[PDB]
Amino acid sequence: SLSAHEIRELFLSFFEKKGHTRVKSAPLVPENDPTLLFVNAGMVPFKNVFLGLEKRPYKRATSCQKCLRVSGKHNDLEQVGYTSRHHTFFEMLGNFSFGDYFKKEAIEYAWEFVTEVLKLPKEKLYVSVYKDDEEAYRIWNEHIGIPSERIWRLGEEDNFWQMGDVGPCGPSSEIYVDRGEEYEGDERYLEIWNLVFMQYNRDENGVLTPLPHPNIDTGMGLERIASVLQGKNSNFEIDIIFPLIQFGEEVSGKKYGEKFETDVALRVIADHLRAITFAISDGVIPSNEGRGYVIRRILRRAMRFGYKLGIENPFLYKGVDLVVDIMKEPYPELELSREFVKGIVKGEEKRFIKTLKAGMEYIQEVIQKALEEGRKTLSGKEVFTAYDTYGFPVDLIDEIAREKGLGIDLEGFQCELEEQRERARKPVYSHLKELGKTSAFVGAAAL
Numbered sequence: 001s002l003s004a005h006e007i008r009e010l011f012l013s014f015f016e017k018k019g020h021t022r023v024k025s026a027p028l029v030p031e032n033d034p035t036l037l038f039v040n041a042g043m044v045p046f047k048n049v050f051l052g053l054e055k056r057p058y059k060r061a062t063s064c065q066k067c068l069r070v071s072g073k074h075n076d077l078e079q080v081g082y083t084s085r086h087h088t089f090f091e092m093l094g095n096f097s098f099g100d101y102f103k104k105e106a107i108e109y110a111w112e113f114v115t116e117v118l119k120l121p122k123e124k125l126y127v128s129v130y131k132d133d134e135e136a137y138r139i140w141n142e143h144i145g146i147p148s149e150r151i152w153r154l155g156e157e158d159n160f161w162q163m164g165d166v167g168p169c170g171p172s173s174e175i176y177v178d179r180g181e182e183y184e185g186d187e188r189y190l191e192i193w194n195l196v197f198m199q200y201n202r203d204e205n206g207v208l209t210p211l212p213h214p215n216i217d218t219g220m221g222l223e224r225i226a227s228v229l230q231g232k233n234s235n236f237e238i239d240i241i242f243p244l245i246q247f248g249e250e251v252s253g254k255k256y257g258e259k260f261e262t263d264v265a266l267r268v269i270a271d272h273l274r275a276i277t278f279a280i281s282d283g284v285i286p287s288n289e290g291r292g293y294v295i296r297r298i299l300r301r302a303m304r305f306g307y308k309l310g311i312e313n314p315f316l317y318k319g320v321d322l323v324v325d326i327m328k329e330p331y332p333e334l335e336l337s338r339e340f341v342k343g344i345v346k347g348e349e350k351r352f353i354k355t356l357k358a359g360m361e362y363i364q365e366v367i368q369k370a371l372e373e374g375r376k377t378l379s380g381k382e383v384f385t386a387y388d389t390y391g392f393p394v395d396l397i398d399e400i401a402r403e404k405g406l407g408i409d410l411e412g413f414q415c416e417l418e419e420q421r422e423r424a425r426k427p428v429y430s431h432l433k434e435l436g437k438t439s440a441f442v443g444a445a446a447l
Contacts, residue, residue: 380412
């Protein structure tokens with residue numbers, strides 16, 4: 001019913017209709033936060049304002065934020081392709097108070113938007129609050145008029161938010177849509193909005209004291225809500241994503257929705273195309289460490305799944321064109337970076353494709369021999385070969401082996417690394433013993 005592009009502008013213009021200043025998406029890469037690789041949510045750009053370190057001409061903000069979930073405590077990379085809900089890159093709609101309005105308004109606005117602007121039947125909406133948050137329950141039940149039967153009081157894991165282990169925190173309220181009895185669990189009661197009531201400060205001892213000025217933080221995933229409004233069962237079948245699945249079909253000659261493993265590769269390519277396009281446009285260069293390596297991995301993973309579909313040549317650079325053309329309205333700057341991003345991608349593909357094929361042969365070889373001889377893991381040496389000789393990211397090796405039931409000898413791989421680190425001994429820096437763990441985020445040459 002509503003195009004993804006349409007949903008975005010509405011959200012923005014609706015909150016703009018209420019004192020909110022439309023702040024544009026901060027780049028995926030944090031200008032000054034060398035600890036965090038990518039912006040993973042809404043408030044990150046606004047973090048200091050929520051703390052009182054940065055002032056702002058406004059007390060109300062709204063935005064559609066370019067987000068990546070490929071690092072640290074918010075890392076969905078391992079799941080991308082296997083489900084219908086996970087992303088590397090995605091857009092988050094948010095409304096924030098610093099701290100002007102609190103729970104009531106945040107709830108009032110959110111209810112209005114979902115009922116009036118989104119036009120979703122109110123009897124098909126469920127809400128969750130923190131069991132100890134009586135104020136929030138009250139607002140929903142009495143003031144908004146949600147029957148007690150469509151309100152959930154849940155615990156800390158479900159309804160309490162924290163900025164970190166210390167600092168600003170508070171209860172949260174999530175809005176769900178009952179998609180029908182034809183579904184199950186969180187797929188039936190699909191969350192579309194998370195409202196955060198930044199109410200408390202947690203000190204170094206874990207004690208919670210009230211904040212002088214309560215804050216508001218919210219997040220609504222654009223791809224997910226669009227799937228509800230477009231009646232889709234997957235984020236990948238939406239107007240602004242499905243064309244990329246079709247790009248995968250056209251190049252491979254395989255069809256979506258026939259074989260599960262075929263769809264996985266298709267979803268991986270479609271999603272990764274958006275990630276690489278947006279990251280390289282925002283200034284990231286594929287390298288062997290940090291932000292550059294995460295995208296190298298993403299790009300390599302996509303190359304691998306395409307080759308799994310029988311694509312013997314580079315194709316990912318062609319997909320950039322589609323993404324740019326699909327996302328040029330809300331992000332007109334993607335057009336200035338188009339050819340630049342395309343060239344970078346093609347060069348990366350061209351640089352690694354032959355080494356990927358040769359590596360896949362080696363990996364499938366030792367994998368096959370291990371099954372013939374009754375081995376349940378790839379030895380440390382074999383993992384080091386594919387990682388060092390063929391430049392395969394560890395996570396990728398672990399995933400290819402996982403396809404046939406084999407794990408990877410982690411202690412043996414750690415051992416092998418010290419022995420290699422030793423060849424120089426007898427950029428990036430690793431504690432000894434960290435090396436096994438550090439190798440999941442850097443290329444072999446970086447060690």
